[PDB]
Write a protein that binds this ligand. Sequence first.
Ligand SMILES: [Zn+2]
Ligand SMILES: [Zn+2]
Ligand SMILES: [Zn+2]
Lengths: 81, 97, 101, 91, 97, 25, 127, 214
Amino acid sequence: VLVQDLLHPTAASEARKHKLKTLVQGPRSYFLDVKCPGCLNITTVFSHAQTAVTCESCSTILCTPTGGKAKLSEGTSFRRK
Amino acid sequence: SINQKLALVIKSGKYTLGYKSTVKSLRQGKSKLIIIAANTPVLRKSELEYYAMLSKTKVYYFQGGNNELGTAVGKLFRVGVVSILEAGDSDILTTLA
Amino acid sequence: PLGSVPEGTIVSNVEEKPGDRGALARASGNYVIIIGHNPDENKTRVRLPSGAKKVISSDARGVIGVIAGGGRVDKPLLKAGRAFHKYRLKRNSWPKTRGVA
Amino acid sequence: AKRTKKVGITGKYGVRYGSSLRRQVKKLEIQQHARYDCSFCGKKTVKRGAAGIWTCSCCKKTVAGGAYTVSTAAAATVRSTIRRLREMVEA
Amino acid sequence: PKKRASNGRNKKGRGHVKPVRCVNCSKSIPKDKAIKRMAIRNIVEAAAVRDLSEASVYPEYALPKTYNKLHYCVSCAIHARIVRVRSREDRKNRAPP
Amino acid sequence: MRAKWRKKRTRRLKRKRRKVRARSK
Amino acid sequence: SQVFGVARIYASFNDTFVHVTDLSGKETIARVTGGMKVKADRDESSPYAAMLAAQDVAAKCKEVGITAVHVKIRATGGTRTKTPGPGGQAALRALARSGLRIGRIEDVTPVPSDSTRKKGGRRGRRL
Amino acid sequence: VVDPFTRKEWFDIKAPSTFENRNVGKTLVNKSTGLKSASDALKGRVVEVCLADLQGSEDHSFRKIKLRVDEVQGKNLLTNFHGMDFTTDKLRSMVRKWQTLIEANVTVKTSDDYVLRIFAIAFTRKQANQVKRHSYAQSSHIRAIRKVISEILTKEVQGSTLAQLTSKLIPEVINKEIENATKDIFPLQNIHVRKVKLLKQPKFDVGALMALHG
RNA sequence: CAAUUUU
RNA sequence: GGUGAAAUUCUUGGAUUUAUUGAAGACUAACUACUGCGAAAGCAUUUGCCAAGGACGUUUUCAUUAAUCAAGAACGAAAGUUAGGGGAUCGAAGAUGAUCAGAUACCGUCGUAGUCUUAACCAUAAACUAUGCCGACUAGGGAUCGGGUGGUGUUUAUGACCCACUCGGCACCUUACGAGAAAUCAAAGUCUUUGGGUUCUGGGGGGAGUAUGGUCGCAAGGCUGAAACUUAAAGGAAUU
Ligand SMILES: [Zn+2]
Ligand SMILES: [Zn+2]
Ligand SMILES: [Zn+2]
């Protein structure tokens, strides 16, 4: 306060200000490279959820929708996408 | 309930309204789950249930009124009896069984 | 019969004594409660639509439900005409002149 | 147009019988002339013929109901206040 | 002037709450408003409870307790409930003593 | 007095005057 | 190994009212008021008028068989003061001395699920 | 005048048999001479009695009972059960502030031909390590645990004629399983039932009563 | 418990 | 009973109290909070249906569609009106015992209209947070409701709770930074260093929300609304 730097902020301070009240606007979601244990290929899934995603052969579950981010529900895979 | 579930059928699956095109469509067994209103008269309700007893088809006693069922199938209109004769993209077969 | 009905109900067209064939609360839109019931001393206690208490026999029958046609008297007779015509099927009781005349 | 503003059905009496006594008919006179939702055939064709009778036009079943309307305020709380009471002789 | 910060009692962002009834003066007051007083420990007290156990069979081990939850008004709280100090800085305390 | 019981004296003198204006037309 | 009773001690303000009933709850034995004893009309709510009122209820109970009681205090009840008046604590000790036996003091004051407005009005009784 | 406390005479009270000793009360009615022979003409009284004397374990001090006279045999009798209720001080002691009271009102028609209206109470406790003194519910946990506390007392049907209900309400085995059905939300509080009042006495039950004798 | 006036 | 004290008022025909069944209408306890929803009224028994909404999330879409609004409308506690159902409890008028020098008041026992519910009306109140609506800045704190993120957390495999956040909501303390006549205020600040946008209202007190005209109402009345004339004080906030 009374003198600061607004151009080299604390890089660990985006927990401390909102996703939409920071200097350069930036989202916080990402993408989930998930896989079904019954099947062979990879798909990407938004980290938050909406309509429930599918698979090619045993098209049951890769993520579930709720009020926050999704849940994969069988431990498979996430690098980053 | 099932007011949303009829609406899933009428845009997608073949169905016949009324009373005479659900008795003609029942002499081959080609109709499934005749939905019946409540105050439809017991002269015909107790003996199209009797046809359903021989055709081995389900009956749902839709406990809404007579003119209530016309709104449920969307019609600007007063229906009494529907007859879903195919359910090609539906889920009504086992959830009312 | 009143011995066959649970108390607190709304009986109608009750008799006064069994076999008398209709006695009590027959007019347009009136009805009787049964207040209590006495198994010793075979008897029921109704209250008839005057609001007076009454003990009567527990085999006096009665149909259940207010007699249809309730609420005639909201409508004013509104003229001499349809006051003449409600009486001239019943009896000569009209027009009554005042005794001071 | 609106041929009369506030008198409604009871403009056939003209200038007589009063003000607060005609409108005591007017909130009743329309109630006996209307069409009621016939709960048996399923249509709106209930009309009176007398003090109490309410015939239907299709399937012709006469509900012996209220004197001026179909069901009274009394009979509103009568078939309910034995439906309250009919289960007591059962359970 | 305006002598109370919360001018009404505990009625902020709500509007008009409910009435509830007093004890002695028997008048209605808003439920959030006036007075709630409870401080009791045991009520059947030393009028020989020590000589009530030998005035009893099955010496009963509890000597049971009553509970009420009463609401005074304010104009009987001044006549009954001891206040003893209300200056213009001790309108702000929050303690039971 | 209050401001409620001259607000009662005025609206119940007005019933006296709006009928004496209908006696003399 | 002795006979129980039921006391039903009523104690409003402006009167105290002590008796004893049977253990079946129906047969009533010797109702005693405060207003019968004194002739002052204000001592109906006095402790000392309620003191010996348990004695004439005790020797009435001890001469008919009754030895022990299941005593129950009772306030005004309903929508009234709901606390006992003056003569409550003056009376329960007053029969404890008299060769009686006590088990399971209760309280039988019924409070409502709040309803049915009481007296005074809206602005209530004025001092 | 004629002192009517001396032509009555003393009588006994006996209780049913899913209990220990049944020397419960000692009443007195009249002498049953004609002009109102009071032999089978008392017939309608009830007895409000505690559970300390009746089970011996005085730590069931509250949860009172009411017991109802049916018929008489020779200055003795046998009675039948008439609903378990709580007391006007525990349920006034129990409701502390900063918590939430729940309820469950399920009119259960029995296996036999009664109906009885069991109730229930509940509160929520400080799951300690607390810092938050309110300890409320979401008020959709109130709706949630009511959907199972109004169902776990509906396996009363298919069995448990009221003596077996008395063998199920007295040992508090039904207060156990609320903890073992609210592990969804909430392990433990003093989950009681507080009342059961019955409405539909069918008969006299001539041959279903005197088997409860000893 | 009840209390009126002081040009 | 009944109050300070008593008296009207029921009662040995059985009152008061006691237990048992019942009815009927009214209300929703204790839980209940410096807490929730609603546009303001208002809103606390569950259960089921009907539609609707606030917040929080999203790397979904549309591209300025927006703020406040003359005219005109929707909703609008209590009392009141019409016509019915019901009128248990309380209870304007009314009777009637106290009280008084005076009491058709306070105090006391009863009691009508009403309190409730249907179909319409009425459209005002301390409808108060007496301190418009939208937009942005300016000190710190601590606690709570709802939503979301991370903890190598505790407890019983989620759930509940603990810890650090952050969005929105009801508020609360501290200090005067600022402001004001002062009370006090994180808005009543960013104003004589005078301008973000935009509705409504006021000009000394009375006369007076009256008269008159219009207009709505079934009516009580509501909205619009003056003046002749008469006075130097009404008035606010704190000190003795
Ligand atoms: Zn799949
Ligand atoms: Zn018809
Ligand atoms: Zn008050």
